[PDB]
A paper describes a structure:
ZnT/SLC30 transporters are major players in regulating zinc homeostasis, by harnessing the proton gradient to mobilize the divalent cationic zinc across membranes. ZIPs increase the cytosolic Zn2+ by either importing from the extracellular space or releasing the stored Zn2+ from subcellular compartments, whereas ZnTs remove Zn2+ out of the cytoplasm and maintain physiologically low free Zn2+. ZnT/YiiP mediated Zn2+ transport is mainly powered by proton gradient. Here we determined four high-resolution structures of the plasma-specific hZnT1 and the synaptic vesicle-specific hZnT3.
Residue numbers in the entry:
A (entry chain B): 53 to 203, 228 to 403
B (entry chain A): 53 to 199, 230 to 403
Write the structure that this text describes.
């Protein structure tokens, strides 16, 4: 046919999409209510380790909100001001969740630093122990529910690992609470625990921001490489040297490509165009590929704007920057 | 030429860029010194209007740093993983500045609400008056030094000069009558609301640019009409035009041509018309035979005339289900 060959038609209200959104807000509601209970307990206990656990629960709630808004907004069609669509809402929500986690972790880190230096605080061991045990039981209940509700095919399995990690962190906080309750004169255990767990949370959120910032710079997607795309385009019969090969990603799974193709004077543009588009779709699954077909016009051999970028890496290409810094 | 007519290949380093480099360093150093003075004064006096002034200076310094890093990055060429270049550093720096402003002003609102509720804080009137007077004097000195980016700097300095006259008025009122201690939280509240109202439009523009949205200056209808005006075109579909920054615009579209039209002629005419009329920094358009099956095909139909709010209002049916 035409550029619609083997195209996946995206509907609005997919029943699988409805199931996903249903389980998503169920998990979100459970996380929010248990976060509320746990933060009330932490405010009662005047501690900060369970405050770090509540911050982690807040991060989980924010991530679920970001996923839910993205899921809803993906159903809406592309408009005259959002011609690509509302896909990048997922990336923006991920960045917002990371920023919120950074803010809360920084606030808690500053509070822990103040508590460590001033060392003027009292901790209610009776309340802290009860609320930490409640959190541990909550994580165990969530894990048991997820295992029982498993074998949505991959969502439950993906959530199970995170529940296990939260359970391990809850065991850490519970051990800190035991140490504080049995020996109240070790009251500095709570700031140390919250400091270490905030550092761990920042380390865990470090890699999920690199991908978001790489996407939000119109950068090449991690999965798809420039070299395979260029080789695939050049391997199409009748194709000479190409230029202006722009390919980027709207999200982790939505990849868009664009290129200029220079063909021989004896090659039919339609056939080579269709072959290149089909090859790109089959090999890489680009969700949108609008490539331009031109005659060779040998004058581009001397054109500086038609030269492909060098194989230098991002870290390497920025090492000549200090020349501008020095000046 | 072929497709790069009027290439405009900007040099990596230009003397104007070095001049902007020197100007930005001077401004950033002055603003950082003024930040140091303001924060020391506020910490000494245990006030909060000085903290709001320091927050605005933090926003200004963040804007300076973002603009300077963007200027540095614009020099660097396109990389095999950054094929579009480092252009969107402008947008990311603006977003970072706005986010930092929002976080700092949220902390300040929290502190102001706590101070208003507890109503127990001993603030030294003399020290806070001294730092407010120093801030006003420094802002007037910068205005006098300032006597393009120069006009924008002058109007921003005037705005901040009124911003600091607010602090000076609050300071003289609290110093003349120590009883009116509660004027500081009100001043901080009003000042922060003004800052939020000022910083909302830039956040909206940055979010529109990041979401691959159509740039405000360029309209979908003029581009569609221009692409349909060239002879030999009957179906423009999958038009995708977005913007890396406020000034960098990228466009991409199909062009369905009939069997009687030369693809290169219409391609060159459309590219020239787009570059001349809208100034697109990169236009990559695809030419195809009309293939009348496109008349009944589904996703090669133009999106309907509807605003972003209008289309989103049909969304609420999703949640109920
Ligand atoms: C009624 C029961 C069913 C409920 C199931 C619904 C839950 C779905 C969310 C699971 C979740 C919530 C955490 C659950 C806490 C409590 C939940 C349950 C408690 C209440 C009963 C935790 O998922 C975990 O998050 C961790 C954070 O990375 C991470 O861990 C791992 O990564 C480490 C490196 O990162 C590494 O070391 C190691 O590989 C792991 O450690 C993994 O992402 C994952 O294990 C969110 O993370 C998921 O991550 C996916 C890609 O990120 C993404 O999935 C999709 O979402 C939409 C779906 O269609 C849809 O838009 C998309 O397909 C997609 O975007 C979403 O972001 C989010 O869904
Ligand atoms: C020793 C000499 C130093 C001279 C300083 C030169 C620095 C120039 C920066 C001035 C600045 C900070 C101002 C802080 C003042 C400094 C205080 C102390 C300094 C004195 C020691 C003004 O900041 C803007 O000013 C606008 C006008 O005030 C105003 O916007 C609103 O208010 C108006 C009503 O006021 C009203 O019309 C309207 O509602 C709005 O318009 C806002 O204040 C604010 O957005 C920076 O932002 C400006 O905006 C540009 C995009 O950000 C930016 O250009 C960039 O693009 C270039 C090409 O793409 C490229 O080259 C670079 O990417 C970069 O340049 C410029 O940098 C600058 O033009
Ligand atoms: C009451 C008072 C409270 C006040 C306290 C509030 C203050 C809170 C502040 C917290 C602030 C705490 C911030 C700590 C996070 C450090 C990680 C990081 O910023 O890095 C990201 C990097 C990508 O590189 P990377 O993530 O490091 O590399 C990862 C590799 O890929 C391995 O997987 O992008 C960038 O340059 C971003 C540049 C931005 C720099 C600024
Ligand atoms: C803690 C949780 C609740 C956060 C959820 C994630 C958000 C950061 C996401 C959810 C949906 C996203 C929004 C979806 C739609 C738009 C519209 C878009 O605005 C326009 O196109 C302007 C239209 C106009 O003003 O006419 C700007 C980005 C924005 C606000 C997105 C920015 C990021 C948002 C707010
Ligand atoms: C003093 C503070 C409060 C002011 C704000 C700090 C700025 C100097 C920061 C804010 C956001 C930063 C930008 C955010 C993201 C990026 C992407 C980053 O691109 C990458 O190479 C990452 C992705 C990849 O490796 O592919 C380059 C630096 C840059 C422009 C950052 C430069 C430094 C900026 C402007
Ligand atoms: Zn097409
Ligand atoms: Zn979790
Ligand atoms: Zn060329
Ligand atoms: Zn070309
Ligand atoms: Zn200012
Ligand atoms: Zn079609």
């Amino acid at each position: 046919h035409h550029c619609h060959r083997d195209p996946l038609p995206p509907p609005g209200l997919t029943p699988e999409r409805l199931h996903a959104r249903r389980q998503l807000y169920a998990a979100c509601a459970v996380c929010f209510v248990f976060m509320a209970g746990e933060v009330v307990g932490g405010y009662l206990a005047h501690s900060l380790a369970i405050m770090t656990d509540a911050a982690h629960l807040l991060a989980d709630v924010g991530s679920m909100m970001g996923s839910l808004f993205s899921l809803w907004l993906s159903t809406r069609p592309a408009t005259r001001t959002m011609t690509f669509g509302w896909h990048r809402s997922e990336t923006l929500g991920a960045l917002a969740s990371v920023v919120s986690l950074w803010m809360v972790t920084g606030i808690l880190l500053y509070l822990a630093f103040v508590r460590l230096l001033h060392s003027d605080y009292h901790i209610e061991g009776g309340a802290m122990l009860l609320t930490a045990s409640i959190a541990v039981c909550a994580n165990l209940l969530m894990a048991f529910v997820l295992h029982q509700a498993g074998p949505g095919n991959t969502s439950v399995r993906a959530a199970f690992v995170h529940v296990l990690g939260d359970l391990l962190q809850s065991f850490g906080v519970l051990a800190a609470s035991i140490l504080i309750y049995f020996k109240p004169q070790y009251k500095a255990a709570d700031p140390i625990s919250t400091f270490l767990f905030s550092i761990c949370a920042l380390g865990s959120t470090a890699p999920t921001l690199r991908d978001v910032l790489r996407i939000l710079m119109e950068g090449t997607p991690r999965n798809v490489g420039f070299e395979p795309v260029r080789d695939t385009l050049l391997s199409v019969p009748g194709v000479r040297a190409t230029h202006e090969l722009h390919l980027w990603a709207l999200t982790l799974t939505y990849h868009v490509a664009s290129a200029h193709l220079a063909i021989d004077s004896t090659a039919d543009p339609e056939a080579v165009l269709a072959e290149a588009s089909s090859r790109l779709y089959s090999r890489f699954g680009f969700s949108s590929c609008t490539l331009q077909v031109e005659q060779y016009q040998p004058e581009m051999a001397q054109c500086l704007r038609c030269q492909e970028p060098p194989q230098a890496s991002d870290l390497e290409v920025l090492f000549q920057g200090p020349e501008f810094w020095s000046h």
